[PDB]
Amino acid sequence: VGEALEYVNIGLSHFLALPLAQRISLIIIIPFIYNIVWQLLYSLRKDRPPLVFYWIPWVGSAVVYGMKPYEFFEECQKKYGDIFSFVLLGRVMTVYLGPKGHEFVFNAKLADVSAEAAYAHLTTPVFGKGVIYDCPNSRLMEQKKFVKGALTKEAFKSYVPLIAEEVYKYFRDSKNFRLNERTTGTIDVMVTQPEMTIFTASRSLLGKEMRAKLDTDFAYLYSDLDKGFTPINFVFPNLPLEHYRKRDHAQKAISGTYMSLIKERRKNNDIQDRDLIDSLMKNSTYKDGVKMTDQEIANLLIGVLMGGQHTSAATSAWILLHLAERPDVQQELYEEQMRVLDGGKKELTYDLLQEMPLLNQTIKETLRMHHPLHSLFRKVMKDMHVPNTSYAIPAGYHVLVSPGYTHLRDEYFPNAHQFNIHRWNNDSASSYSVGEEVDYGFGAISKGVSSPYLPFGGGRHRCIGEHFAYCQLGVLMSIFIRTLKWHYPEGKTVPPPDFTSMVTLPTGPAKIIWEKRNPEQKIGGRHH
Ligand code: HEM
Ligand SMILES: O=c1c2cc(F)ccc2nc(-n2cncn2)n1-c1ccc(Cl)cc1Cl
């Protein structure tokens, strides 16, 4: 054998003397083969959930996942059931589909999984520091407690006329509408809905100063910060290219603006309750006694607005697109508007919004068929055992939960692919805890997360903007419905979703034709 141990040696030297043709050829075929072999070996573990097969190492199933994630999920579900892992741009994602999925990931022990470990690389470049996913979970919990303290029923009662004012101003002044000079037109909902979202959100959460700056060049900074919030930040987070530093410019620029306004409200004492900025100023002292720096506060503002911008605008687009081919639902929604607002002689209020169940059902149903975030991740911190199986999810893996996939399942939603607001009759609540509650720092929320309809997640990371979004979407749709009818151009229909972005947007252009319900109606106020 010693004459073979000489030969491993010899053979080794001859490898180092291959032409660079075969050397490069080998540095690609050696890893390709080991990859394929490791998988076959992997499939013989019985404490591991089935791993989706793939050819290209590191990249894994990222193509099909990234492009059509629900269909990926469905085919995986058919060959392996509800638990399966797949590889994604260097990471291993264990997907648990269905309500026990929600349970296993949303109700995971703090010690078992990390949300900030998963998200901070995407969000921190964008929002700034010391906030959201750039702090310990405990801090997050109190930050949510803060924000949510400006998301009160009385807050909502002041925001509603402000939001309405913005919609009306938008109809009057935007080149997309100009209702005072045109009775009909075509809009890209993907153009209109983002401006409407930022305008209304800005004016209400950030106040009238901050809204006004959007009428200037300053608005482009929101657009710059916007582009840095993209999945590419997951694999290539900081690359010395130009989109990355207009991003960082904007983060600095916008944050500075808030601090400018923050500090000068304190150097006066223009501290009321008008907006979230007032609120966070009066209310951002942690339980251990620390106060949020002005910088942190501002970064928390950026985060809050960013999160409500994309989800809400997408939902707003989808509502318009689904209704554009359902003049019966527009008709139904309009009658409810007339009955609740007494033919329009009542002014819209947060209270009156709550008495529009069909309106809220449309929001509800849209959020069902078009959940904004098709995937939520965690990273596993301790080996997790999955009941009732032999599976251990080893630390360093990622768990992926996808309530939006469950939303589109016939098992839990009869005719799941049919837009039907009436599947929610006598049931228009944004959401409700259907049993016992629990509190993590920002208020009592559902303890069980087994509801097959989970648009806002659950557990410690559960959303806190649900009521803001229904408020915004409510006022928005109330006014669209009372002002306009709208339909598709010839042979157009509901676009299919673009899953590749951070949010599941419709595939643009998604155009609708509007026409005034009342051609001779003039929106008041003044423009130049
Ligand atoms: C249609 C609108 C929205 C939908 C469908 C939605 C959905 C969600 C979901 C699924 C989560 C949980 C994320 C996870 O567990 O990994 C979440 C979290 C959160 N959302 Fe929303 N959201 C919406 C709007 C908003 C708005 C308007 C705001 C703020 C004004 C907001 C702020 C937040 C915050 C602060 C969290 C906490 C995240 C954490 O603790 O990790 N969201 N949202
Ligand atoms: O970062 C994320 C986020 C990151 C992901 F990788 C996936 C989904 C996400 N979903 C949300 N949102 C949930 N509601 C609104 N946005 N946020 C997020 C969470 C909290 C805040 Cl303040 C802002 C954002 Cl964008």
Residue numbers in the entry: 8 to 535
Sentences from the paper on this structure:
Lanosterol 14α-demethylase (CYP51 or Erg11p in yeast and some fungal pathogens; sterol 14α-demethylase in fungal phytopathogens) is the primary target of the imidazole and triazole (azole) antifungal drugs, often referred to as demethylase inhibitors (DMIs). The CYP51 enzymes of fungal pathogens and yeast use eburicol or lanosterol as substrates to produce ergosterol while their orthologues in plants and humans use obtusifoliol and lanosterol, respectively, to produce plant sterols and cholesterol. In order to better understanding the activity of DMI agrochemicals, we have determined how selected antifungals interact with their target enzyme using S. cerevisiae lanosterol 14α-demethylase as a surrogate. We have also determined seven high resolution X-ray crystal structures of ScErg11p6×His in complex with R- and S-TBZ, R- and S-DPZ, FQZ, PRZ and DFC.
FQZ binds unambiguously in the active site via a coordinate bond between the N3 of the triazole ring and the iron of the heme cofactor. The dichlorophenyl ring binds deep in the active site adjacent to G310 in a similar manner to FLC. The rigid quinazolin-4(3H)-one ring projects towards the entry channel in an orientation with the aromatic ring perpendicular to the non-coordinating azole of FLC. Y126 is shifted away compared to the FLC structure to accommodate the rigid and bulky ring system with a close contact between the fluoro substituent of the fungicide and the phenolic ring. No water (743/843) is seen adjacent to Y140. A limited number of water molecules were modelled into the structure of ScErg11p6×His in complex with FQZ due to the relatively low resolution of this structure. All complexes were crystallised in the space group P 1 211, with a single ScErg11p6×His-ligand complex in the asymmetric unit, with the exception of the ScErg11p6×His -FQZ complex, which was crystallised in space group P1 with two protomers found in the asymmetric unit. Comparison of the ScErg11p6×His-FQZ complex with the others shows an almost identical protein structure, including the transmembrane and amphipathic helices. There are two protomers in the asymmetric unit and the interface between the two protomers includes direct hydrogen bonding interactions between the phenolic hydroxyl of Y341 and the main chain carbonyl oxygen of E418’ with a salt bridge between E342 and K107’. Again we observed 8.3 fold (3.3 ± 0.7 μM) and 4 fold (1.6 ± 0.5 μM) reduction in susceptibility to FQZ in the Y140F and Y140H mutant strains respectively.
